Amino acid sequence: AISIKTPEDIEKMRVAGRLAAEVLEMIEPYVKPGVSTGELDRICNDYIVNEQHAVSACLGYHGYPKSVCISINEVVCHGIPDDAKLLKDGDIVNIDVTVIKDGFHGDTSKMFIVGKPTIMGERLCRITQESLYLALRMVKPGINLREIGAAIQKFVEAEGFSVVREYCGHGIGQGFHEEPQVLHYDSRETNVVLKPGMTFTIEPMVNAGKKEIRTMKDGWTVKTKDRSLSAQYEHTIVVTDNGCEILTLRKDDTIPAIISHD
């Protein structure tokens, strides 16, 4: 049930991927102390709809009431935007976007540091991105996804942090969440060999503290059990003949779009 994309399919994901990356690049100037998450959400939505002529995949998904996910500090993921939640100096915030264009999905997220960063915040964001980059560098045909989850874990743990088990990367295409489940840790349950034409996301969530998490009464919001800060980055990629191509690459990414093995 793992869908293999045709080249035409891939051309469309490249567009959707770029659109999604673009929302992230666009929003940056608005991320400042005093802005509410509800306003960031509206700016995004407007852009998506009125400028891009695309659609947010989040709006209505299983009942999701907003256009993007905004997770502050200890919120792990799926934080709900709100007019009352204002950003302060030193906050670390994840903005997660998923756009639909020509029926294809593009899913990506990045951390933003509000005003003057904290040492921990900065550190955690860095290590989290590096862990995603590490995984990307390993992607190529013939390798088992298991090896990827394991390298991520090993890296993160050596850096004194913890990896969230409960949520993971996923296949993506015409469908928002397709097979397979991309675990960010070492698990004997994982046994998936990569092949060209496969499209999925890698989106490790790392905790400054302990790995444990808790779901809010809102049924969306996830927070760390120990209230420590949590960070995440996400990219959508396609497995190529000799490596991978990052479909959601941004101007600020410091990794090449095409990774080649030889």
Binding status of residue 178 toward Co ion by CB under 5 A: no
Which of 55, 44, 45, 92 has its CA nearest to residue 72? 92
Residue 115 DSSP symbol: S
- The least CB distance from residue 119 to ligand NLP, in Å, is 27
Q: Is 244 helix (H, G, I), strand (E, B) or coil?
A: strand
Residue 41: half-sphere exposure toward Cβ, Cα within 13 Å: 22
Distance between start and end Cα atoms, the chain: 30
CB of 202 to ligand NLP, least distance (A): 10
Is 177 annotated as belonging to a binding site?
yes
x-or-dash string of contact with Co ion, 68-97, rule CB under 5 A: ----------------------------x-
Q: Minimal distance in Å, beta carbon 6 to Co ion?
A: 22
Closest CA to 222 of 78, 113, 94: 78
122 is in an annotated binding site: no
Burial of 141 (0-12, 13-18, 19+ CB in 10 A): middle
Q: 46 a known binding residue? A: no
Q: Which is nearer to ligand NLP, 192 or 261 (CB)?
A: 192
| 184 labelled ligand-binding | no
Choose between 56 and 230: whose C-beta lies nearer to Na ion.
230
Instruction: State the residue for tokens 């999604």.
Output: 20
> What are the structure tokens assigned to 125, written together?
């964001």
Least separation in angstroms between residue 203's CB and ligand NLP is: 5
x/- mask, Na ion, residues 182-221, rule CB under 5 A, reads: ----------------------------------------
- Is 203 annotated as a binding-site member? yes
* Distance in angstroms (rounded) separating the CA atoms of residues 56 and 183: 25
Ranges within 77-96 binding Na ion (CB under 5 A): 94
Q: Report d(CA 67, CA 55) in Å as an integer.
A: 9
Residue 102 marked as a ligand binder: no
Which residue, 218 or 241, has its beta carbon nearer to Co ion?
A: 218
* Residue 235 annotated as part of some ligand binding site: no
Residue from 37, 52, 71, 108 binding Na ion (CB under 5 A): 71
Runs of H (alpha helix) within the chain:
7-27, 37-46, 119-138, 145-158
Please choose which of ligand NLP, Co ion, Na ion, none residue 71 contacts, taking the beta carbon within 5 to 8 angstroms, the exact cut-off set by kind: Na ion
Stretch that binds Na ion, among 24-32, 47-55, 225-233, 251-259 (CB under 5 A): 225-233
In the complex, minimum distance from the CB of residue 199 to Na ion, in angstroms, rounded to a whole number: 26
Which residues, including other chains, have CB under 8 Å from residue 172's CB and lie 6 or more apart? 105, 107, 178, 199, 200, 201, 236
Interface residue list for Na ion (CB under 5 A): 71, 94, 230
Q: Give me the residues that bind Co ion (CB under 5 A), please.
A: 96, 107, 201, 234
Annotated binding site for substrate: 78, 177
